[PDB]
Scaffold this active site. Structure first.
Site, PDB file in Angstrom:
ATOM      1  N   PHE A  32     -33.055 -68.876  51.186  1.00  0.00           N
ATOM      2  CA  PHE A  32     -32.472 -70.117  51.679  1.00  0.00           C
ATOM      3  C   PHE A  32     -32.642 -70.333  53.171  1.00  0.00           C
ATOM      4  O   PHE A  32     -32.294 -71.411  53.663  1.00  0.00           O
ATOM      5  CB  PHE A  32     -30.972 -70.167  51.355  1.00  0.00           C
ATOM      6  CG  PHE A  32     -30.673 -70.094  49.893  1.00  0.00           C
ATOM      7  CD1 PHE A  32     -31.278 -70.974  49.001  1.00  0.00           C
ATOM      8  CD2 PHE A  32     -29.784 -69.152  49.401  1.00  0.00           C
ATOM      9  CE1 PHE A  32     -31.005 -70.913  47.641  1.00  0.00           C
ATOM     10  CE2 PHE A  32     -29.507 -69.085  48.042  1.00  0.00           C
ATOM     11  CZ  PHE A  32     -30.119 -69.968  47.160  1.00  0.00           C
ATOM     12  N   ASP A 155     -22.245 -56.186  57.629  1.00  0.00           N
ATOM     13  CA  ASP A 155     -23.567 -55.720  57.201  1.00  0.00           C
ATOM     14  C   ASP A 155     -24.241 -54.940  58.323  1.00  0.00           C
ATOM     15  O   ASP A 155     -25.433 -55.115  58.597  1.00  0.00           O
ATOM     16  CB  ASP A 155     -24.442 -56.898  56.734  1.00  0.00           C
ATOM     17  CG  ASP A 155     -25.696 -56.457  55.976  1.00  0.00           C
ATOM     18  OD1 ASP A 155     -25.854 -55.244  55.693  1.00  0.00           O
ATOM     19  OD2 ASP A 155     -26.533 -57.336  55.661  1.00  0.00           O
ATOM     20  N   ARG A 159     -31.290 -52.082  60.114  1.00  0.00           N
ATOM     21  CA  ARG A 159     -32.094 -53.284  59.903  1.00  0.00           C
ATOM     22  C   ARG A 159     -31.478 -54.508  60.571  1.00  0.00           C
ATOM     23  O   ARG A 159     -32.169 -55.520  60.745  1.00  0.00           O
ATOM     24  CB  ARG A 159     -32.280 -53.534  58.405  1.00  0.00           C
ATOM     25  CG  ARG A 159     -30.961 -53.762  57.687  1.00  0.00           C
ATOM     26  CD  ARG A 159     -31.100 -54.018  56.172  1.00  0.00           C
ATOM     27  NE  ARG A 159     -29.753 -54.080  55.615  1.00  0.00           N
ATOM     28  CZ  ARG A 159     -29.052 -53.020  55.220  1.00  0.00           C
ATOM     29  NH1 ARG A 159     -29.590 -51.803  55.244  1.00  0.00           N
ATOM     30  NH2 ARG A 159     -27.816 -53.183  54.770  1.00  0.00           N
ATOM     31  N   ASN A 160     -30.196 -54.444  60.949  1.00  0.00           N
ATOM     32  CA  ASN A 160     -29.537 -55.532  61.663  1.00  0.00           C
ATOM     33  C   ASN A 160     -29.280 -55.187  63.134  1.00  0.00           C
ATOM     34  O   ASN A 160     -28.331 -55.691  63.742  1.00  0.00           O
ATOM     35  CB  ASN A 160     -28.234 -55.925  60.958  1.00  0.00           C
ATOM     36  CG  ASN A 160     -28.445 -56.963  59.848  1.00  0.00           C
ATOM     37  OD1 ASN A 160     -29.365 -57.784  59.905  1.00  0.00           O
ATOM     38  ND2 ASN A 160     -27.581 -56.929  58.829  1.00  0.00           N
ATOM     39  N   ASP A 173     -27.492 -60.385  62.712  1.00  0.00           N
ATOM     40  CA  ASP A 173     -27.243 -60.484  61.273  1.00  0.00           C
ATOM     41  C   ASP A 173     -28.283 -61.453  60.726  1.00  0.00           C
ATOM     42  O   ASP A 173     -28.138 -62.669  60.877  1.00  0.00           O
ATOM     43  CB  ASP A 173     -25.828 -60.956  60.966  1.00  0.00           C
ATOM     44  CG  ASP A 173     -25.516 -60.936  59.468  1.00  0.00           C
ATOM     45  OD1 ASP A 173     -26.265 -60.309  58.685  1.00  0.00           O
ATOM     46  OD2 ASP A 173     -24.491 -61.518  59.078  1.00  0.00           O
TER      47      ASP A 173
END
Ligand SMILES: CCc1cc(NC(=O)Nc2ccc(-c3cnc(Nc4cc(N5C=CN(CC)C=C5)ncn4)s3)cc2)no1
Ligand SMILES: CCc1cc(NC(=O)Nc2ccc(-c3cnc(Nc4cc(N5C=CN(CC)C=C5)ncn4)s3)cc2)no1
Lengths: 298, 298
Positions: A32, A155, A159-160, A173
């Site tokens: 999205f 989260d 990777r963030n 994020d």
């Protein structure tokens, strides 16, 4: 009481004309949404163009995602500026779909940085450790800042975390700009695909996210950080036995290159009792001490 | 007028009792001298021990080397403190042979650091370039400081640059603590073994060392820096043809990864006319500009 992003203000001081953006490469995309590098003319100085990152939705997005991106804009405006967060620089809320303009980090995410360092002598070992301690410190400081604003990340993971000029790390994020369908680190748990191996037990079994569940995730982050990007709980699939093992108290062992005190921080982040885990402000002080003592190490 | 080291003072504020030193590993050694890591109890704080480097002579040293080491002590005391030089911390001039106590740099010399980086993706390329620009800047600042004190280094090269905590570089001179008999980068030219491939033509053919010959050597340093530690003039032995080629104006080509402006600095450092070479203070300003523009690079 944690922030309700929908009930934050939007200040039109952030408004920037979208025709002054020139879009480049996609930095990440999911179903999205996406984040795209761009040049913004006149964003800070009227005659200067600078590189930014722009988060935007794809035409497949629904009302829920449109509201989500506006809420992200509101949160970023409310947080204000911190060296170790991706900072808001502007937004386009009129003349087309919502655009959210932030700092661009030039070295990509920490997970990929780490995995190249492992796809690769005591001096190099020592210098890499100096960097890893720095990264752990900067992330803890950015998280202490988020907590001070009553914000929960939900989260946190290598990777963030982004890396930029000066080896400065910035928490981000990617959110809707991540293809979590095709990221094996996100697994179906009920109705959603969640990063279960990074999640506290109270988040897994009660869908409760708190200051303390973020600390649990920071502990898992420390483990991937000192394992040069390995996925946590190596070899174990997320299934019925994984949930029970976590409930009974099993935890990862120390990474082979983690300093003893960083392993002790990890272990305390993974306490089954959230009230026994350290706060981020406590973690900042503990890592400050390790960095200070690291100048005594040869 | 360049300093005469023999006519500098020695301040007994530097005096430190040698029995408070605990010697460790040899960091470098030549025929007449060595540098050894050591722990110094009470050197800075009365109840604290810190790691230092100690330069000392071997029993084979003669009066000439004994005078040389005292002169080195005097020069280091006269220079005072700069972030990008190895700094004097104390000395032992009584109770035994002369000991010279300096800062210890924890990552070794830049030449070895570079050669591991080459015994090894655009993001890693970009980050390495950020480091190399930093190193070029720090060395130019340390050399500008030496020149401001009317000091000539005479042996500037990556092997005489140390790396320490924070990726800070410090110019050093191993001097008598280097086995130049067995270092192919030092070649017999008349009576001595000199680092001819780093030396300006006026130094080779007239034995004249100046502010400007140091700049020439800095240019060669930039070349090894951006060649990840390759020896200069690769494939060419230092013989009759090398001297003539340098006299006629032949120069090394750009390293493949040197930025255009760093190559232009190199070329100007190698001008046959010393008065046409940049000064170190001019080089500092040029590299400052490149670093400033590097935040515009993605
Ligand atoms: C923390 C609180 C919070 C944040 C938030 N939103 C929130 O972070 N959005 C958000 C905004 C911005 C970003 C990004 C900013 N810069 C980025 N750079 C790169 C570079 C890169 N490279 C790969 C390879 N190469 C070699 C060619 C170079 C570069 N690859 C991927 N990305 S990605 C991420 C997410 N909401 O709350
Ligand atoms: C500039 C004006 C001037 C200076 C001067 N004298 C002048 O510099 N003496 C002088 C004093 C001190 C030094 C040194 C200081 N720290 C050093 N550390 C290391 C570390 C190292 N490692 C290797 C490997 N590993 C992994 C186990 C770790 C470490 N290897 C080699 N060295 S060497 C050099 C020379 N005179 O004028």
């Amino acid at each position: 009481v944690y922030i309700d992003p929908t009930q934050l203000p939007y200040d039109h001081k952030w408004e920037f004309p979208r025709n002054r953006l020139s879009f480049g490469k996609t930095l990440g995309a999911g179903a999205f949404g996406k984040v795209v590098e761009a040049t913004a003319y006149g964003l800070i100085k009227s005659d200067a163009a600078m590189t930014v990152a722009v988060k935007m939705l794809k035409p497949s997005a629904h009302l829920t995602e449109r509201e989500a991106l506006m809420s992200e804009l509101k949160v970023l405006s409310y947080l204000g500026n911190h060296m170790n967060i991706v900072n808001l620089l502007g937004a386009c809320t009129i003349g087309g779909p919502t655009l959210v303009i932030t700092e661009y980090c030039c070295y990509g995410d920490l997970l990929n940085f780490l995995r190249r360092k492992r796809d690769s002598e005591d001096d190099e070992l020592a210098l890499d450790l100096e960097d890893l301690l720095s990264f752990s410190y900067q992330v803890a400081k950015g998280m202490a800042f988020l907590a001070s604003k009553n914000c929960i990340h939900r989260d946190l993971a290598a990777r963030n975390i982004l890396l930029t000029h000066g080896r400065i790390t910035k928490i981000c994020d990617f959110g809707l700009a991540r293809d979590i369908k095709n990221d094996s680190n996100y697994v179906v748990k009920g109705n959603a695909r969640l990063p279960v191996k990074w999640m506290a037990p109270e988040s897994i079994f009660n869908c409760v996210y708190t200051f303390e569940s973020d600390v649990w995730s920071y502990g898992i982050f420390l483990w991937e950080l000192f394992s040069l990007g390995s996925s946590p709980y190596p070899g174990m699939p997320v299934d019925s036995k994984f949930y029970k093992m976590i409930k009974e108290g099993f935890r990862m062992l120390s990474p082979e290159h983690a300093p003893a005190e960083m392993y002790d921080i990890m272990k305390t982040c993974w306490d089954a009792d959230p009230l026994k885990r350290p706060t981020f402000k406590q973690i900042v002080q503990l890592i400050e001490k390790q960095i200070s003592e690291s100048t005594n190490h040869i």
